[PDB]
Write a protein that binds this ligand. Structure first.
Ligand SMILES: *[C@@H]1O[C@H](CO)[C@@H](O[C@@H]2O[C@H](CO)[C@@H](O)[C@H](O)[C@H]2NC(C)=O)[C@H](O)[C@H]1NC(C)=O
Ligand code: NAG
Ligand code: NAG
Length: 438
């Protein structure tokens, strides 16, 4: 994709902190950038759209290469168009913004400078942040996570990609998404079909695969921490159903792990721990600490979770499912959890902990998003039963308090139009350097 010249692209400033062993922390001057899929895409020769709503202009885009040559991503009005506002160390994302047009959700990335994403290697470190999910009802997902996207957005070896990280280009994740308009420096017009339900999306012939660390996927009802492995941890391109993942006809046939090794306190049998008025009270802001412990050789072997709220340091809840003990993500837990729930261990199949270790060494980009789910209505995160026809007596089926008919986008984009999430006070450093409490 080309650089559009009709609207200035200004990345909203966002501060975050780096801490060292002593507990002392310094402030970084970061910036946020909107993912390329949300942007206006128009001709390099004027204002004619290359894409509108769910449909490509086939004169401007008769093939994937020519499209990339002809089409430019332009600047975004973060607050007015997308409901994205950054102030100090705080990033707020609104679910629905009714400006001149209707916008639903957003996906943003943390930048080091105006043409490079910030990268993280969190091995033997912790990533910590505050969040307010009180405005997130059933069906919403405020996600804060990491993927090994190229720091420059792909420009160094993609001749038709000039827009790069400056315009939020380069997304990949563990579902090998095919809804991306631009993948590895080519458009995705070939094979494109508009979505059956979503006015503003579709799927193309190719998908964008990489490893994915879902540090945080949550609403006011439930939360999940889920690493996902991949054969090759950085971006690879796939075609059609061989991609695997959500919109494939054969979910587990690809080169990535679409399910991950998840820890949702509710799914692990504790319904009293996280939610409204619970031990982690989603009525109020709380701190989320995620620690990445290593073996003697520097490979990842455990992800621990702590919360801080109202001054109290709260350990992660123990899994109470018979055969699945502990409160952290380890190889023992992942093995046990997949065996006991009867889920396919694609986490292990694509390299597991060694894969995530490789992902961190390659460098992870921080992603902060808010979305609804046209595929499964976020029932995997918050439903009384997923699948909706499964027996709630069977361990692993129940994930939250939401009904099996909750979270339908056409419903919630109206009924939850005021929904939002606020991520704030990001801190990174050695284990136990980023937080304190009783
Ligand atoms: C991107 O996906 C498109 C669509 O599937 C692929 O285009 C096909 O390419 C094959 C091989 O050249 C042709 O036989 C077909 O005619 C194309 N199909 C369509 C619908 O145009 C393209 O190969 C993919 N890109 C990559 C890098 O795999
Ligand atoms: C597609 O782009 C061409 C070239 O700019 C333009 O003339 C035409 O009106 C566009 N077609 C549609 C259907 O938008
Ligand atoms: C860090 O803090 C946790 C929570 O209090 C504690 O369990 C652990 O022993 C500490 N580890 C280190 C390396 O300081």
């Amino acid at each position: 994709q080309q650089i559009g010249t009709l609207t200035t692209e200004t990345h909203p400033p966002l501060t975050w902190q780096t801490c060292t062993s002593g507990g002392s922390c310094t402030t970084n001057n970061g910036k946020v950038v909107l993912d390329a899929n949300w942007r206006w895409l128009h001709s390099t020769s004027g204002s004619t759209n290359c894409y509108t709503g769910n449909t490509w202009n086939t004169t401007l885009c008769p093939d994937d290469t020519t499209c990339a040559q002809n089409c430019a991503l332009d600047g975004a009005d973060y607050e007015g168009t997308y409901g994205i506002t950054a102030s100090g160390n705080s990033l707020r994302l609104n679910f629905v913004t009714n400006g001149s047009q209707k916008n639903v959700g957003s996906r943003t990335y943390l930048m080091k400078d105006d043409t490079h994403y910030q990268t993280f290697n969190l091995l033997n470190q912790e990533f910590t942040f505050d969040v307010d999910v009180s405005g997130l009802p059933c069906g919403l997902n405020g996600a804060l996570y990491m993927v090994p996207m190229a720091a420059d957005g792909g420009v160094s070896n993609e001749p038709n990609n000039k827009a790069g990280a400056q315009y939020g280009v380069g997304y990949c994740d563990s579902q090998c998404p095919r809804d991306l308009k631009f993948i590895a420096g080519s458009a995705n017009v070939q094979g494109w079909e508009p979505a059956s339900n979503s006015a503003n999306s579709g799927l193309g012939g190719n998908g964008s695969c990489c490893a994915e660390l879902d540090i945080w996927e949550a609403n006011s009802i439930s939360a999940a921490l889920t690493p996902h492995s991949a054969d090759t941890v950085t971006q690879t391109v796939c075609n059609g159903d061989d991609c695997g993942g959500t919109y494939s006809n054969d979910r587990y046939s690809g080169t990535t792990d679409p399910d991950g090794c998840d820890f949702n306190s509710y799914r692990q049998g504790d319904t009293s721990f996280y939610g409204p008025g619970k031990t982690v009270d989603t009525n109020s802001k709380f701190t989320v600490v995620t620690q990445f412990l290593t073996d003697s050789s520097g490979n990842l072997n455990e992800i621990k979770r702590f919360y801080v709220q109202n001054g109290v340091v709260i350990p992660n809840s123990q899994s109470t499912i018979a055969g699945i003990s502990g409160n952290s993500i380890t190889q023992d837990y992942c093995t046990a959890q997949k065996q006991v729930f009867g889920d396919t261990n694609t986490w292990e199949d694509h390299g597991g902990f060694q894969s995530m270790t490789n992902a961190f060494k390659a460098g992870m980009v921080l992603v902060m998003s808010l979305w609804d789910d046209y595929y499964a209505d976020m029932l995997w995160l918050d439903s009384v039963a997923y699948p909706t026809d499964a027996d709630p007596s069977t361990p692993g089926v129940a994930r939250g308090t939401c009904s099996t008919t909750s979270g339908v986008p056409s419903d919630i984009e109206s009924s939850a139009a005021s929904a939002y999430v606020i991520y704030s006070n990001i801190k990174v450093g050695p284990i136990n350097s980023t937080f304190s409490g009783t």
